[PDB]
Symmetry: D6
């Protein structure tokens, strides 16, 4: 019945750790997706653990494919463009494309969107891999369509 | 009278427990919300649950549209609200889309138990506390006793 | 002769980190023990690495023994009760008892008190194992009794 | 559907952690190059994992080349010169050149700029390798020239 | 005349060195208090002593009730003021309950040496700066000379 | 074309972590070296990975040589003296000298100043190995003289 | 016709695989022993079973004196013929002496299956193969189906 | 001019380690494939570190596909059939299939043969992954056809 | 048919280590019969349990007449030993009979112990074997371990 | 002064282990190159730890280059062909080329020969990297042209 | 019983015990012939280090205390040195080899032998300890720690 | 009092494994050194854990220094020459010299000989670093001069 801890918290201490940044960014990404397309997008994965559709996004931006449509940049002074030169790679590639990290990339055809949101920690720049969809059935179309898109490339 | 080197009297602002502000806010609000929906008082039985089996079963039931799981509420407004089962690691393919487990307050009402995967940002990466709630101890004991046969049912 | 560093101390910046939380809890534990048991309890192990008599406490709370007495809860909105179910157990235990973490237990006859103080750091919630006692010889009697109690119960 | 969390995000609490310094530094780098070269460079790499063209940069500055031009120093009281003494190296090179870390170097004809931004983390001093460029074709030519320049260096 | 990217002149509050404020407040008062007990000015000779032998011998002496290690003070009030030496893993335990090594200032007044295992909190757990004090260099060396003589004398 | 994050960052957010102490300390170490030696000194390594000439310093202070000279102590209440005992070594060294950490040591003839700045990561007492010099040829002459000095120590 | 460096030609002994002789002798003799006891042909299906569930079912059945499993024979003469279930770690001290699992062949003649945990010497400590047998796969499929219902009643 | 070690050794210690076992098995598999299909086969991969086309053979024999054909069993007293029950997967997969290990399987029209040869070492029984083919032309098509079926199956 | 068609000679049928193990176990059983008149049999071949093995070394160290020293396994290996553990602050100078390379027996309890030395790796390790007259003598002995552990503790 | 070990090591026991096989293969390889190139080749690396000139060889055979010439196969029943497929690699390659393992290759103008001698250890199949050269100048010339060759493909 | 192969007497041989038995028998035989008393094994691979260090230092300091009895292997090292590159203060004393040698403290009734063996090629050493009677062994172990204290002074 | 082990070893069974080849190599190296320098060399380090003077041997051989003199080669078909190429080192040496491994060298004035005997174990070529000398005083002088040489070269 008695409680050792009787400290009265200030309301600011009830704030979550970092949810303000994530919230403002998610709100503005959804808002801008609507600004361009007029649709109500929604978050579906916070730190996406799946790589196949993300490597597919990378390939589609590199090849200058039609519908992988850059929407906006997350942070202004982080990288706006990037290259694909890996010194380890046996045969180098020199494609200079727009940045995957720090950019919002929407497939409006498949009603889906992707985000690679930077954040600073441990003396390095790290990436939140977020996934967006205006409605469930379109997301369900994209996830179904991932393996077909691979089969054509294969 | 033996003396003390550290003669500074620490302040009340400096007695604040690290992390308990947000955790207490969220647990109290989950308690209040569960009371508003199911007119009963739930209380914490686990803070971060090392066990996974019944947690797995909650996910499996929400995936298979099972009746007993019920989605009480969402924890964070701008965080995830749905999720998918697609695991590229697994050879077997499933593409089912359901509501989220993380950021979701759930309740088995007949069984008298409640589940929550409270998200939190630590070192950037998103992690979750698996919190388990119950009304009375007999309800929780019945749930734990029935969890292990449900595995037989699935298998 | 001279010194390179020449910055004053407001003494606001002279305060130790973590002692404020530890001091409030330790003092309120000692106070709460006085209100219930009118005698003075003192810290003897801040983070007791000895797991044997802590194991014995948990089994006594499982068994329903009246020897351990639940004096108070440490945090209001942390676990007030727990269970002994673990997947890995070949023979499962379903006993639901009061929590060990977030609780203070005092053996009144032996003059010894246990406090498993929760703390949120990094990955999860973790627990300080603090051990209190009224006088030195009661502590000695408890420790010598530990190992007999260990092999009597088995 | 209501939400469990209801706290009000403040405008000071909406800030990103550590971006204000990285952005400030990057902005001041881009402002410095324009005040000296009349053209707009942009960030094409933040923390650069690639090493080969960075080692060609340090080789150029060590070798008294005029190809990289020192533009500015990032921090005033950090290292402003350096040397190349490794005890494990059997034959020591004692060359004293200008700093690579804490310095911004530029290849004006190639259109590519280099920056090694220092920072303090868990004690030790580390560095972000930043890479700048006027335009994409400037970058593609630089990347295409890295391995050829290495072939000449080995010849 | 080379430009500088970083142009931010800091207020005085943020040139502060983290941790030195607590350490300095502690060291000053340890030296101050060690004057009132033994009337001698004291000085730091090891800030985080990495050697273990003579610190281990301090525990044996306090465990034995030896008259020479004398308890100057406790560092933090609400931390441990006593401790014990039971080891579950040790095949034959020792149940001695003495005064806490951590959180205490102990001084060998004749040898002109003082020991301080200062507590501090890092990553949750409680950790201890082992700080070594002395009055002058010749006494310190004399004590340092005495470690191995004092070490195997006890074995007898 | 547009930007998602649009916080009007306040000027305080432009500060860099750890620089305030480094800038103040490096500036004052420089000021001190001019006052007692009449020459301007500058940083050549902020955290020196090298160990050989740093080890030579401690033997010069341990042997009371003219070669080093104790300019000042960096922190008031940290070690102003130290000792060289190591339990693991069979043959002991009981020499008590002055502190390497918390001290500024200058070779006034060679124009090279050493500083081992202590810092608290809160976790422990760690040290930055800074190296100062007046000019590049004085530095080059020191780096070359290290190994002949080491060969003389061998005899 | 191109050359080959290895013109050496193998003794017929070197054709022999390492370890198969002992494993084959045992499998042959275990089969023959199952053939003489139950008059039917029993054959191998698992050579080192990675599945623990139906093997720990076997242990408890033997421990509980259950009539369901029968003990066909012993692998080795001077190895263990009996055993106990005492685990110092367990707070529940079990003092039951039953026939050994290792060095023993067990069989459920009802279900048309046979169990053999064959002991082998390697690197000092004794280790064991867990080999599974069955008359025909039609019999085995029912047993594999039957594992989960039996594991259920214990739950 | 001189040499320290002057020991003369004839053909008897010129033996390589383990090749005698590998040679006898490889020679007989090739010969047995010749008697069944009339076409000389040859080894192209010894211990195939790749996994995905070997999963195909696993699924084919289990799924009762007539793509594989059982050429022979390698060892007489090792397993001739196996099963797929595993604790991790909630799916029981009680399917009783012919053994992948200890069996030589060949896709005769595709000209590619498989063999998971077994060996006893480290106590545990382990398996080589030898891959046989007749001509380099068919082999190239097989590798290029392996990536389709992974995307086709899903 | 079967790829492998080499017929084993009988020498290849043998098992590594069992020949020595069987010889030693047989002769231990023979030696115990010809001293105590009762047939002993193996109940554990490499006992992982340690509680009653520790009690045996102390009974031998205490000069206790409870355990009876029956035989030595290897002629020229150790026949005496000491417990000097430099790690401990208390050096023990007690010279007791060797646990390793010896066969002990509790005739009343009907249980025997053997620490059989084997030369493998570099160092010398040991098999710890348990023997017993019958099942009930074993069960009674096994249950007496926890009582005797309580006495030595107090 | 005496000697404890009075056993004169027996003649059969004096030979070393592995040199008989290694000596056979090197002697046969050297002889093989003498007929094929009319010059004496000699060993310069017995277990070559270097990777750069070995990774260039496999690319040379892969590319169909005319510089490297196949001399002989080491073991008859091991691989005589292989493929460069790595399912891990994002850049797929399905080339079927001659085997580097089990083969002796030579750069006859450059005066350097390579041999990847296969051996069986602890189950898996492994390789000895052996390098031959006609004279030191040839070796110094090959070594000085390795790194320029590496930057040529990029 | 499943396994019915009857092992030959040669098959019953225990690996390693032949060499260990030969070496132990010869060491004890030499000890008897030189000092007239029967020595016997008290440690076969002594995990302890202190008194072994005492032997090494007694030979390094050329004390007349330990007597060199024998060399175990003819072609292995008969001499050795104490240079350790990692030790800052280097001792260049060249003493006789501890490994490959049998040394005895004849009054103290104790013998030491560091027998070399080759495993994975690399040469390692079995430390073996011998004594005439248990009481002499007790006395030696008793004096071990005071010997360290004396070296400390 | 009894002994369980009742098998009497034969003389072949007494063999210390490895001492035969090691003894042949040491005896032959000693004899060759006697024949070349008319003096008697003797082993002073069996498996030298020290690296400094061996690195100095490598330096002197690389620079053709007159002080080390090649005495013999250990194995006939092993490498007689070697190179000093390391990809890991940014600036590389291409020098081709006589092999340190498989060779016996000797500093004839210092009275100290070096040998690096190769051996084949578990699929790897490894090296016993053996040190030889005529008298202890010359060995002492060499060890004393080690560090001087070390910073003489630098």
């Amino acid at each position: 019945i008695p409680f050792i801890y009787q400290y009265e918290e200030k309301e600011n201490e009830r704030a979550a750790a970092g949810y303000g940044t994530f919230g403002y960014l998610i709100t503005r990404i959804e808002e801008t997706l609507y600004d361009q397309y007029g649709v109500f997008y929604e978050l579906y994965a916070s730190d996406d653990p799946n790589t196949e559709y993300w490597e597919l996004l990378v390939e589609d931006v590199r090849s200058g494919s039609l519908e992988p449509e850059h929407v906006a940049y997350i942070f202004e002074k982080l990288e706006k463009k990037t290259f694909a030169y890996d010194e380890d790679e046996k045969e180098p590639d020199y494609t200079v494309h727009k940045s995957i990290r720090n950019s919002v990339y929407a497939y409006p055809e498949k009603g889906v969107a992707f985000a690679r949101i930077p954040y600073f920690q441990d003396g390095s720049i790290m990436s939140f891999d977020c996934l967006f969809a205006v409605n469930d059935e379109k997301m369900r179309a994209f996830l179904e369509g991932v393996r077909p898109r691979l089969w054509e490339k294969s």
